[PDB]
Write an enzyme that holds these catalytic residues in place. Sequence first.
Site, PDB file in Angstrom:
ATOM      1  N   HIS B  41      73.946  21.365  49.076  1.00  0.00           N
ATOM      2  CA  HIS B  41      74.057  21.377  47.612  1.00  0.00           C
ATOM      3  C   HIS B  41      72.963  20.626  46.874  1.00  0.00           C
ATOM      4  O   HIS B  41      72.795  20.790  45.663  1.00  0.00           O
ATOM      5  CB  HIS B  41      75.461  20.952  47.126  1.00  0.00           C
ATOM      6  CG  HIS B  41      75.669  19.473  47.027  1.00  0.00           C
ATOM      7  ND1 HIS B  41      76.306  18.751  48.007  1.00  0.00           N
ATOM      8  CD2 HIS B  41      75.419  18.584  46.021  1.00  0.00           C
ATOM      9  CE1 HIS B  41      76.446  17.491  47.620  1.00  0.00           C
ATOM     10  NE2 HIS B  41      75.914  17.375  46.414  1.00  0.00           N
ATOM     11  N   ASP B  90      78.168  22.521  53.811  1.00  0.00           N
ATOM     12  CA  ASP B  90      77.278  21.675  53.043  1.00  0.00           C
ATOM     13  C   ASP B  90      76.372  20.833  53.935  1.00  0.00           C
ATOM     14  O   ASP B  90      76.491  19.603  54.009  1.00  0.00           O
ATOM     15  CB  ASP B  90      78.110  20.811  52.095  1.00  0.00           C
ATOM     16  CG  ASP B  90      77.303  20.297  50.915  1.00  0.00           C
ATOM     17  OD1 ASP B  90      76.112  20.643  50.794  1.00  0.00           O
ATOM     18  OD2 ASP B  90      77.866  19.547  50.107  1.00  0.00           O
ATOM     19  N   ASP B 186      84.348   4.396  47.325  1.00  0.00           N
ATOM     20  CA  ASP B 186      84.034   5.797  47.626  1.00  0.00           C
ATOM     21  C   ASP B 186      82.523   5.966  47.455  1.00  0.00           C
ATOM     22  O   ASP B 186      81.862   5.085  46.929  1.00  0.00           O
ATOM     23  CB  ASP B 186      84.810   6.696  46.605  1.00  0.00           C
ATOM     24  CG  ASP B 186      84.787   8.202  46.952  1.00  0.00           C
ATOM     25  OD1 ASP B 186      84.382   8.601  48.054  1.00  0.00           O
ATOM     26  OD2 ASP B 186      85.220   9.001  46.088  1.00  0.00           O
ATOM     27  N   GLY B 190      75.065  10.746  43.566  1.00  0.00           N
ATOM     28  CA  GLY B 190      73.713  10.520  44.047  1.00  0.00           C
ATOM     29  C   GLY B 190      73.625  10.106  45.508  1.00  0.00           C
ATOM     30  O   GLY B 190      72.534   9.885  46.030  1.00  0.00           O
ATOM     31  N   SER B 192      74.973  11.970  47.816  1.00  0.00           N
ATOM     32  CA  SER B 192      74.983  13.268  48.507  1.00  0.00           C
ATOM     33  C   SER B 192      73.852  13.448  49.522  1.00  0.00           C
ATOM     34  O   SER B 192      72.693  13.154  49.212  1.00  0.00           O
ATOM     35  CB  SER B 192      74.930  14.398  47.486  1.00  0.00           C
ATOM     36  OG  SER B 192      76.145  14.513  46.779  1.00  0.00           O
ATOM     37  N   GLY B 193      74.199  13.956  50.706  1.00  0.00           N
ATOM     38  CA  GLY B 193      73.216  14.131  51.750  1.00  0.00           C
ATOM     39  C   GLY B 193      73.069  12.933  52.650  1.00  0.00           C
ATOM     40  O   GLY B 193      72.567  13.078  53.756  1.00  0.00           O
TER      41      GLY B 193
END
Lengths: 142, 254, 192
Positions: B41, B90, B186, B190, B192-193
């Site tokens: 994504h 993803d 959590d 930003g 992500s990945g």
Amino acid sequence: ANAFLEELRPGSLERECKEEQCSFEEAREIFKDAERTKLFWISYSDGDQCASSPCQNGGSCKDQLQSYICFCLPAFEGRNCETHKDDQLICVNENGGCEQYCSDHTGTKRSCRCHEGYSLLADGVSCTPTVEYPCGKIPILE
Amino acid sequence: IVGGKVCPKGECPWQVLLLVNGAQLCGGTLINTIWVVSAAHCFDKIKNWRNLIAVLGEHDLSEHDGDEQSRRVAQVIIPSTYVPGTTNHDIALLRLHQPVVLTDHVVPLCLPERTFSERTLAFVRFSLVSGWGQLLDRGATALELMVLNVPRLMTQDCLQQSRKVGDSPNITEYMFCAGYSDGSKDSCKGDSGGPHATHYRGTWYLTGIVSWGQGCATVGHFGVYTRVSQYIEWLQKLMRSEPRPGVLLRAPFP
Amino acid sequence: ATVAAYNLTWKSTNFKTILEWEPKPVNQVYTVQISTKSGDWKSKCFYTTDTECDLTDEIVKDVKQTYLARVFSYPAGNGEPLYENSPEFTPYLETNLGQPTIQSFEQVGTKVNVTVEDERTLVRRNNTFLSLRDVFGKDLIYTLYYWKTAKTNTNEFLIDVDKGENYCFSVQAVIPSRTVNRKSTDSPVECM
Ligand SMILES: [Ca+2]
Ligand SMILES: [Ca+2]
Ligand SMILES: [Ca+2]
Ligand SMILES: [Ca+2]
Ligand SMILES: [Ca+2]
Ligand SMILES: [Ca+2]
Ligand SMILES: [Cl-]
Ligand SMILES: [Cl-]
Ligand SMILES: [Cl-]
Ligand SMILES: [Mg+2]
Ligand SMILES: [Mg+2]
Ligand SMILES: [Mg+2]
Ligand code: NA
Ligand SMILES: [Zn+2]
Ligand SMILES: [Zn+2]
């Protein structure tokens, strides 16, 4: 148990119930109070669940009411000590004791392997780096 | 990362910072000197494919030091099954143009074997998630690399413990939940990945990729991560592949 | 087919702890996992056809911890499997106290000393099994019913008896601080 000339002898818990097998009423006549009697009878009538020797592999049975508990030697577990811990060396059991990779081999022993950048030690389970900066290690902390 | 701590410089050596046109895009995880694993994504809005940079050894975004190494991203490989705008599959595998140099501050995270990851790593309770993402849901991003310890949940438990939200995405076998439903900790947008790294018998492994969630640290919700174990074979085969002319490659999955 | 286990129940006495469940397997096997709230999951009873699993060795590592188990259902051959969680279980607070045994009764005059046999548990130490007192300490008391009632912080009772009369006795292990499961079953009655 009842056998005429013996019944002339006055009531005795030791003779009628301990030395012989008695009924609830014989016992009731000795104890007189119902609650004293039932207190006696619960364990007396319950029976020894250990009589059949349920604990395997050198275990020890301790009787309970309508049950028992088995005390196992260190190499065994289970309700009846039937489980051999030595026969549990498979990959789903704490990774087969392997530090990194584990491979099941049915009919023979499991083996351990390592990720690229590591090689298996003499112990057959540990892995040691074969490169300066192996993956998954934090250099500033070691 | 919401409710985390600063990862001390050098302690998250596999963390990658992805930039597009010089701007912060997403996180990533170094798995060897040439390959990086990130989230699919992260590449949904990319137009300038020849403008992707991977930075290793990064820590503080406001200051440059000699531990930072930048490399051009030559290839971005994504499952052809992945659908932009959605959550399933993803994952993205990126080839660096030139290899980074391994140092005390740049070390790859071990990509594990599938079986070991499914039967052993999956049952290690806590793992670390990291990144320079938002410090609060819809808040500002972080200047210093942040890290957080999160407990893993089997999907059934995750579903049973999550507050019902209509039209929410299904948690597939290609995902897993980790985190807290109390609104305290959590990973976030930003991040992500970035890596979900698992420590086992003295070595760290790649088990997940920061992927999605209902907001960030939202009560009644957990973070959702790509289940990397489902992609071990796919990743290994593609790392053995020859480079192609264009950057993006939509490769068949499985 | 693969159906999830149900009616997961903890059967524990003197720390011998067996997880039991339903139903009897048909073309499916089971594996059990156990953990503490923040610990890793440990597997036990691998691919068993039993509907029980001895978890004693795991819980006796720390009897004061709260454990949660889960039973996995696998189809007969060898995503995530179908499973069911058990209720939580804190050994120190929930294990049944075993049936005691009067070791001896001795008349030391116009008084009688009644000694309770040390009740051994499944918690081990110097290659030895710990008694209930070793584990519980001041939390454990013994109660005596004689013919009325006496209580002790040790495993001994020193009661006053009427000259020449024969008395009967019976004891119980008690953890006074518990609200539920506070007493063991009565020991066998022993008389003079
Ligand atoms: Ca008789
Ligand atoms: Ca007789
Ligand atoms: Ca009589
Ligand atoms: Ca009679
Ligand atoms: Ca009995
Ligand atoms: Ca910097
Ligand atoms: Cl480059
Ligand atoms: Cl979000
Ligand atoms: Cl005791
Ligand atoms: Mg006699
Ligand atoms: Mg009689
Ligand atoms: Mg009568
Ligand atoms: Na939350
Ligand atoms: Zn650095
Ligand atoms: Zn730089």
